Paper text:
To further characterize the Elp–Hdr complex, we performed cryo-EM analysis of the 1-MDa fraction. The complex is a dimer, (ElpABC–HdrABC), of heterohexamers. Cofactors including the electron-bifurcating FAD of HdrA and the CoM-S-S-CoB-reducing non-cubane [4Fe–4S] clusters of HdrB show conserved architecture and coordination.
In the methanogenic pathway from CO2 and H2 studied under laboratory conditions, low-potential electrons for CO2 reduction are generated by a flavin-based electron-bifurcation reaction catalysed by heterodisulfide reductase (Hdr) complexed with the associated [NiFe]-hydrogenase (Mvh). Here we report that under nickel-limiting conditions, in [name], F420-dependent electron-donating proteins (Elp) are produced and form a complex with Hdr. The Elp–Hdr complex uses F420H2 for the Hdr reaction, fully substituting Mvh as an electron donor module for FBEB at lower nickel concentrations (<50 nM), at which Mvh production is not detected. The Elp–Hdr complex forms a supercomplex with Fmd or Fwd to perform electron-bifurcating CO2 reduction using F420H2 as an electron donor.
Numbering used by the authors:
A (entry chain C), E (entry chain c): 1 to 185
B (entry chain A), D (entry chain a): 149 to 576
C (entry chain B), F (entry chain b): 1 to 283
Write the structure that this text describes.
């Protein structure tokens, strides 16, 4: 197989979105402007040790403005938000905030895993990311707790309020939730 | 027996400080400067790192002090021709070049400049500024006196007819001065590296590639552009500027294996000043190491990023290509992204290093001093005698001893004053 | 003392033993746990925070307004829920424009965030409001256990905002644990993440399980008898992921996973039925 | 009226140079040093960069000159307690701590040291060397006199019985000295940053993690290991050594945003010295920028690679893990390979930075000087008055004004001598 | 598809062959000891602009001793030996010599392309990497030159001398040339 | 004078017009070209140098001994062959151990390398031994042609060893070309490699063709009429690769490729048949 690849091995202005960098900085990632690429973050990163995820390089790309490279990157979703890097960064960059903002842009670009959308749909339907099941219902009953916890599981009005918030923020549209059928699109 | 007089060679900040320290200590001091006015390179700068304070504002009072000090004999536009003898017993022969202007009569009013019809480059503007065949290098010059360059004068006599002090002397001849001194302080400074030989960067071929020192002149409000950073090609502001570090330094392909030690800082300073004047300008630095080692320097670096949004690319550029529209493409690896980049810019500034000045070898041989591996003058001991030389009675001050910034040079000049004063105080 | 009690999802819906042990413990301590009726997912920061900051913040603000209406601070037993709620609280308190946006969203629900209550972690409440002496008094049977304490990440980090203990070398959980007679055993990479945070468990189960497997190997070489955590998210990762690791790579560590509340209840002579170990996949 | 006497505070290379320059200029000079002997940190070094020349070999003659100069009164083991007045009219109150040894009678023979039964750490060995309750810090000490530390003396009187000059005085009391001077030169130097708070690197917990200054003592032939680099854990040579740059510097997580300016060079120097002593040892440096800015420094860096085969990794280490066998794993990204590395080493050396010395605030308030952002003393003007202070008659020299190497400090000391001599020469 | 990869995303002593670095340096690549990773070489490299080949990283790996990573790397064969990097290297590293030595080690490890083996076999059979064909014989005849050039094509003894050299250096065994059959295997 | 004539492979086996033009030109100049009987592949540095240094050096040393026997310097008009032979010569001359090893290998052939002759490039010989004035004299018809000069990498590099001209901005070939009345047109990335060196043409044809396509685009935007080279390897890359590019991507540059010898013959009024343009794939 040839190794020729004329766009993946060079960076020109056509790969750069300056408005993306400005949007990230204005939304709370402004500190990314001033890391000096020491690599402490990558050294601290537990996901970097077992995947191709390189947090230092994500910060670098965000500064350069390589939007398409960042948001389409699967490795972006390898960060557990353990904050170890952010605890150690000598320039006090808010790394985790930058990662989450990049993830928000990626989600807006359609790079959402089906499982994450399933969690979103569970929250829409029941108000819980991890809804209760029958076995836990009976187990709660056994130890004298209520069959249902005093949560959106018990109060339909609370679920209605949560669903109103989700509609108002557009989150249902972000994950392609269909209200009529209660399924994902 | 030790003569209680001193000779200071060079009229930069180092020489100025050494002379003022010696004079304030009571010793009679000659100062020989080859240019028509003292100031050296500091007087050419617009601002200084790390404070961004104006250089002329703080240098000019010292130059005035030198020009009016009772214990200082200032001989500008002159060069040391011979040195004989030893410590306490130096016989020095100086040649005062002819100004064709009477230093005692000239007031520096500038009328002769206004009337002269011949234009020529101003050495103070480093090749990007013009003046007349009769000129005053800059308004704060000390002495504030005119000079006629005979390689450009056509002997029209308009300056002669316009002057009211009768200061124009087209029949002036070079003058020989002989002095006796007990000590000598060499403060002859440096020259900016000329990057023409760096063919891949294209200086002297590409229109919009300039050096850092040229940029200093262009930023300076009293410079030939009235302080505006303008593209040489069209005279408009550059929307995108790149700076390239280590040009002429840290490079065995040109036999320059040393670090010029100030380039990183003045690069960042000029970038900050550009951003200050033109906040919309995009500025990018191609570096290998950021050497922000001085007091406040690391903070200056952080501020370059946080406050002004200056972009830093770790990569030594391979090439600068001139496009048909005269924009410049810098081809360089970003070693931290690990990828080749070809970015476009409207102006490229080469961070040229520091080299020994023109004529350094001749004066070194006249005095009889030794030179270090980097071409600058060698001190007696690199740890404990930084301003002494193995030639007793001769001392070093400023960038003459090697590249360094203003406070380090000033400290060296004060130290050399002390070390020279010791033998003169002893008397034998 | 009174405190609003936030449950989250995993404790109330997968491991009610943790909730029962907590309720009994706080009843023994004279602290009134007041239910947060109508509470929802906090929501989990990993997914919602990654997808849309505004939705995450609005849901968390509604959860906080429940306690504000009740007029009490919030107590959370989950690192994940604590991180979500605490972050939302200090973000809305320190930023007026975002508070206005969130309240504009909340106006449809008939609620309004005021920034009147604090969010507190279960361990912090135990350590500061109760103290080690009172906890030591309530011990009925010292435990002969070598335990590996898993702090989790969002208990103490970001430390600049949380300011509970030193994230690199904390001691608070270790001291609470040793009050029970159990020994907290040092092990390699003790402060490492369990791999479940940030949505990684659902996005790439193999990567998260690799985190867990590394941690379990380090705990096993240290010869511990059980894992102690203050996070039902981490609790689930360790418990279910031990089964997943055994089924995937054929490696079984068989290290029990206990929430700190369950350990305290065991030391305090709680009924075995109250500790719902039937929920745990690891025996 | 300006008193023609000077006070120099600090007995390091900067203070020594300032005092000798003032004395050679004819001014009577007091020197006050808190340690029992002058030398400062330079006397602790084994060799000096960039030449690898012996530090003590060149420092000791100057210390002897200070101890025998007719114009210098040396007051060691003493501290300035009060300063009143102004330029030319300073009244200074000094407290000479009790040695419990008679400086005039003690010959420094060392018999009392041999006979003492109580062991205690030697401050000169930076926490890795032992001596007796009665000690001489190092054989080249000036004055070559004993000192008894009463926190460890058990009053056994063996030292009294063994001494032949009758120099032991267990009943000695602190002595108050009052002096009048016209100028003051503060040359109080620095302390090595203590990295205990850098928990991820494990200093003070990991057995085989040491600082650069500790390594200086171990390398030194007169040090507590007879110049052998030995693992603290077992007393055997380390086959693999890592150096970590910028420890305590360039780090906002600890409020140290400045570059300590010398650590890159002394790191490379000690790596070269290790290779020289043990050519089979593997040595690796974790750095961010190599700041080899000085004369010959870039060449020193190249030589570190070409001649000695020292490995350079561009990455700020995330963590140092101690293994059960007490070897150390450094976890760090190699940013140029773009990958995480976990490399094993037998010893790890932290390149600690420079900080103001213990008690700097008290002396600063006693004199009344201002401090810069980095915690060191502030000069009157950062460009043109590097050794002056806004307090007339008080000057700065050496690392007191900020981190810097030996030649720069020596130049500053000479300059401060000149600047202080000027008012004293004027006399008014 | 999981991103987990335990061995490819971390460097330990197990990935390092120090004897390899020593062998490379002793064979004429000693200058690789002292590049300071400025990236001038990569910037000058025409193949780096269109393939994943990164010469700076090859030099770095050679210094570290990552033998298995270097010799098995297909990108190693993307260097045309244009020497531009070597002309510009500020530390005067003999980059092309290092690349060729690494290639020799790779060939010894069996990483030889079939086309390169074909060139070797052509030299073995005829003494020319590009042997003459019928059409060129005709053109040579028509233009006044001899039908065959005065080379190993004309003189069998010269071909036998070349084949003796190839046997003595073992090159025939390196490319798997079978003398009895005249094929590659 | 007299000089040994090394042919290589590509010139004598694919483009004999280059050889015929060279022979006629040198006959006109009073320089005796002496055949190197029994010469082989130089051998091509890209493959042999990459595979085994010892084999490459031994074959090149045999080629050099062929000329040493005649007591004449070697002249090559191929950048590839020049690089191979010149490098081998200066390696064996400057290293005694390697010379001993190579001669030990050469014992079988009955030859011995002595280090007695020099290797010289065709252009260097023309520029120095003949000079521009004599070449200008031999011109019979000035050419009205816009030419893109392709230096090729191994003519001048490594410059430390070769020391013929400045590799970044050379002029020697341009001056020789303009002696004929043709104009050397500057174009972007003029000094770039053609992509065929180092074995890349045979290993990854697409990459090498991408080099050639970039170069052809830059030449076309400069409006040149032909390419002039001093390397049959480069000649083949440009000629055959224009056809390969047309077949693969449909790009049609249609720029003739001429060796410098052929250009000089054209300016010198040589017969058209002697140029043997029938060998060129590009008309
Ligand atoms: C672009 C640039 C920006 C800089 N910016 C800063 C900055 O922001 N801050 C900072 O601290 N430093 C800065 N520097 C460094 C600073 O310029 C030097 O530290 C300082 O100028 C050295 O002064 P000097 O007196 O030693 O030498 P010079 O300034 O070179 O003065 C030497 C003098 O000697 C004269 N002379 C030379 N040869 C002879 C001779 N044979 N006979 C008689 N006279 C002779 C010269 O004409 C001149 O008047 C910068 C340097 C450059 C190139
Ligand atoms: C590990 C290491 C290696 C180094 N290697 C080199 C090298 O190779 N080359 C080089 O050029 N530089 C080197 N340096 C830097 C060098 O040590 C300093 O530049 C130099 O020591 C500064 O000398 P100083 O006199 O200013 O201060 P110091 O050496 O610190 O001396 C100050 C003196 O003042 C005394 N003092 C302090 N406070 C008081 C007080 N209140 N009253 C009285 N006396 C007081 C101290 O006890 C001491 O005697 C190195 C530094 C370190 C940490
Ligand atoms: S640790 Fe901080 S400064 Fe260093 S690379 Fe990561 S984000 Fe940048
Ligand atoms: S927060 Fe994300 S990038 Fe930072 S150390 Fe944890 S997993 Fe790595
Ligand atoms: S020469 Fe005359 S006109 Fe010119 S500046 Fe001097 S005084 Fe003025
Ligand atoms: S005489 Fe010379 S200097 Fe004077 S005005 Fe004429 S050209 Fe100018
Ligand atoms: S000071 Fe900076 S730019 Fe100048 S030579 Fe040194 S590293 Fe390069
Ligand atoms: S106290 Fe006495 S024995 Fe000790 S060193 Fe002094 S003179 Fe010698
Ligand atoms: S009296 Fe004190 S100093 Fe003297 S020998 Fe006894 S313990 Fe040591
Ligand atoms: S001198 Fe070097 S090691 Fe020290 S702080 Fe500065 S960059 Fe770091
Ligand atoms: S150009 Fe030279 S010094 Fe720079 S990375 Fe390449 S080989 Fe190393
Ligand atoms: S010689 Fe190889 S690595 Fe160097 S520039 Fe040419 S193709 Fe790139």
């Amino acid at each position: 197989m040839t190794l020729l690849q004329r766009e993946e091995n060079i960076i020109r202005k056509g790969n750069i979105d300056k408005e993306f960098s400005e949007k990230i900085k204005a939304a709370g990632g402004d500190s990314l402007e001033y890391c000096f690429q020491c690599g402490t973050c990558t050294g601290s990163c537990p996901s970097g040790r077992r995947t191709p995820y390189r947090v230092r390089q994500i910060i670098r790309k965000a500064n350069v403005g390589l939007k398409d490279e960042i948001i389409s990157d699967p490795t972006l979703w390898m960060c557990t938000t353990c904050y170890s890097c952010q605890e150690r960064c000598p320039r006090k960059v808010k790394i985790v905030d930058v990662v989450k903002l990049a993830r928000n842009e990626a989600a807006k670009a359609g790079f959402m895993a089906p499982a994450h959308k399933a969690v979103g749909s569970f929250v829409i339907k029941t108000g819980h990311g991890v809804p209760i099941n029958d076995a836990t219902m009976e187990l709660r009953k056994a130890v004298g707790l209520g069959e249902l916890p005093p949560t959106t599981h018990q109060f339909p009005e609370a679920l209605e309020e949560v669903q109103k918030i989700i509609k108002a923020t557009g989150f249902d549209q972000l994950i392609g939730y269909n209200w009529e059928t209660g399924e994902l699109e | 027996s030790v003569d209680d007089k001193a000779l200071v060679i060079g009229g930069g900040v180092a020489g100025i400080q050494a002379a003022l320290d010696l004079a304030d200590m009571g010793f009679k001091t000659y100062m020989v400067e080859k240019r028509p006015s003292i100031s050296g390179r500091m007087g050419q700068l617009d601002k200084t790192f790390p404070t961004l304070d104006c250089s002329m504002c703080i240098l000019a009072p010292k130059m005035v002090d030198v020009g009016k000090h009772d214990n200082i004999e200032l001989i500008t536009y002159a060069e040391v021709k011979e040195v004989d003898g030893y410590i306490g017993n130096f016989k020095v022969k100086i040649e005062k070049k002819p100004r064709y202007i009477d230093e005692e009569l000239c007031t520096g009013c500038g009328s002769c400049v206004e009337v002269c019809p011949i234009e020529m480059p101003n050495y103070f503007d480093e090749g990007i500024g013009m003046t007349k065949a009769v000129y005053i290098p800059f308004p704060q010059a000390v002495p504030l006196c005119a000079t006629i360059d005979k390689d450009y004068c056509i002997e029209c006599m308009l300056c002669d007819e316009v002057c009211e002090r009768g200061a124009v002397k087209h029949d002036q001849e070079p003058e020989e001065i002989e002095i006796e001194v007990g000590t000598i302080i060499v403060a002859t400074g440096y020259d900016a590296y000329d990057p023409t030989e760096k063919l891949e960067y294209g200086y002297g071929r590409h229109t919009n590639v300039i050096t850092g020192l040229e940029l200093e002149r262009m930023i300076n409000a009293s410079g030939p552009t009235d302080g505006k950073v303008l593209k040489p090609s069209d005279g408009e502001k550059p929307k995108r500027v790149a700076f390239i570090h280590c040009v002429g330094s840290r490079d065995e392909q040109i036999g320059k294996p040393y670090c010029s030690r100030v380039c990183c800082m003045y690069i960042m300073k000029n970038a900050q000043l550009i951003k200050d004047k033109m906040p919309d300008t995009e500025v990018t630095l191609y570096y290998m190491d950021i050497r922000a080692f001085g007091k406040g320097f690391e903070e200056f670096y952080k501020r370059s990023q946080e406050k002004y949004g200056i972009k830093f690319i770790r990569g030594r550029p391979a090439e600068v290509i001139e496009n048909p529209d005269l924009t410049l493409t810098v081809r360089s690896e970003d070693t931290l992204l690990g990828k080749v980049t070809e970015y476009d810019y409207d102006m490229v500034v080469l961070g040229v290093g520091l080299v020994p000045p023109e004529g350094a070898e001749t004066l070194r041989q006249t005095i009889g001093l030794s030179k270090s591996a980097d071409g600058f003058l060698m001190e007696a001991h690199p740890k404990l005698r930084p301003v002494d030389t193995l030639t007793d009675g001769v001392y070093l001050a400023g960038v003459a001893q090697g590249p360094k910034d203003i406070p380090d040079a000033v400290a060296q000049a004060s130290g050399a004053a002390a070390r020279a004063a010791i033998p003169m105080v002893k008397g034998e | 003392m009174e405190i609003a009690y936030f449950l989250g999802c995993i404790m109330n819906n997968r491991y009610p033993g943790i909730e029962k042990a907590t309720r009994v413990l706080f009843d023994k301590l004279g602290i009134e746990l007041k239910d947060m009726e109508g509470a929802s997912c906090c929501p989990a920061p990993g997914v919602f925070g990654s997808f849309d900051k505004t939705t995450w913040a609005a849901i968390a603000a509604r959860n906080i307004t429940i306690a504000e209406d009740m007029g009490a601070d919030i107590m959370t037993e989950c690192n994940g829920c604590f991180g979500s709620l605490f972050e939302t609280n200090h973000l809305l308190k320190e930023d007026e424009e975002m508070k206005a946006k969130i309240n504009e969203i909340l106006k449809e629900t008939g609620r309004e965030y005021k920034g009147e209550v604090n969010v507190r972690h279960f361990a912090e409440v135990l350590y500061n409001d109760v103290g080690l002496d009172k906890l030591s008094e309530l011990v009925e049977k010292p435990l002969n256990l070598n335990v590996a304490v898993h702090y989790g990440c969002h208990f103490l980090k970001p430390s600049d905002e949380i300011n509970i203990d030193n994230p690199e070398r904390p001691t608070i959980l270790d001291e609470i644990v040793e009050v029970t007679g159990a020994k907290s055993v040092e092990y390699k990479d003790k402060m490492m993440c369990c791999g479940a945070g940030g949505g990684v468990r659902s996005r790439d189960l193999d990567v998260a399980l690799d985190f867990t497997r590394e941690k379990l190997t380090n705990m096993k070489e240290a010869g511990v008898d059980a894992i102690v955590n203050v996070c039902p998210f981490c609790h689930l990762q360790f418990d279910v992921g031990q089964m997943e690791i055994k089924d995937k790579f054929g490696e079984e560590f068989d290290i029990p996973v206990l929430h700190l509340a369950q350990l305290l209840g065991l030391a305090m002579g709680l009924p075995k039925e109250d500790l719902v170990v039937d929920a745990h996949q690891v025996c």
